[PDB]
């Protein structure tokens, strides 16, 4: 339960495989709905229980309730600490664009890495985590762009 | 339980860290189903 970035594993498919990524902060394990669908999650001996998810936000938490509260200012570069499956974490900074929709405007990192990336951290110059990659739309030109998700905290 | 968490790193900001990526702005929608299309 160290704070800091995990990979999500499956033995359900050959071997073992990456299906993701999340963020353990203040005892709680943060990660996209899409990567676990809810199910429980083992750490070492221990069991992890969702707590909180929403499918159309496409979040989860485990042990508790949603902590990542910080936001993009809107203005400010941001780094991606990428988790690919089978390589070493890795700082991508980058200047976000924005994803436009009829309930308002997100910020978006347009950086392609594989699907077992998703859930990894988007973060802000002090460290915060101010939303999750790995959810978002494949555009003409064909690159991958990922919303920055981000949930609220109760 | 078949899914297992594993660490792998701080989450920290990377002053050495390589800059890279664009800084599209697209028209989007959001479904029921948490699928983005673009608009
Ligand atoms: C890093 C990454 C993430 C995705 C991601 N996949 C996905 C799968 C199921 C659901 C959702 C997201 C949200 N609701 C259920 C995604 O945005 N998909 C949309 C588009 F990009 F395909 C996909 C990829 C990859 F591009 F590699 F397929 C990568």
């Not at 999650?41 to 969702?50: A, I, K, M, N």
């Not at 070493?88 to 994803?99: D, E, S, V, W």
């Not at 985590?129 to 109760?154: C, H, M, P, W």
């Amino acid at each position: 339960t160290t704070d800091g970035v995990y990979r999500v594993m499956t033995r359900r498919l050959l071997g073992s495989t990456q299906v993701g990524v999340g963020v353990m902060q203040e005892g709680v394990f943060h990660t996209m709905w899409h990567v676990t669908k809810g199910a429980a999650l083992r750490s070492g001996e221990g069991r992890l229980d969702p707590y909180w998810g929403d499918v159309k936000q496409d979040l989860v938490s485990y042990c508790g309730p949603w902590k990542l509260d910080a936001a993009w200012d809107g203005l400010s570069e941001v780094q991606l600490l990428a988790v690919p499956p089978g390589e070493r974490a890795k700082n991508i900074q980058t200047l976000p664009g924005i994803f436009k929709t009829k309930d308002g405007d997100i910020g978006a990192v347009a950086l392609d890495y594989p699907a077992g990336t998703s859930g990894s951290p988007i973060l802000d110059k002090c460290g915060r985590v101010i939303g999750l990659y790995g959810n978002g739309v494949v555009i003409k030109n064909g690159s991958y762009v990922s919303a920055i998700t981000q949930g609220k905290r109760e």
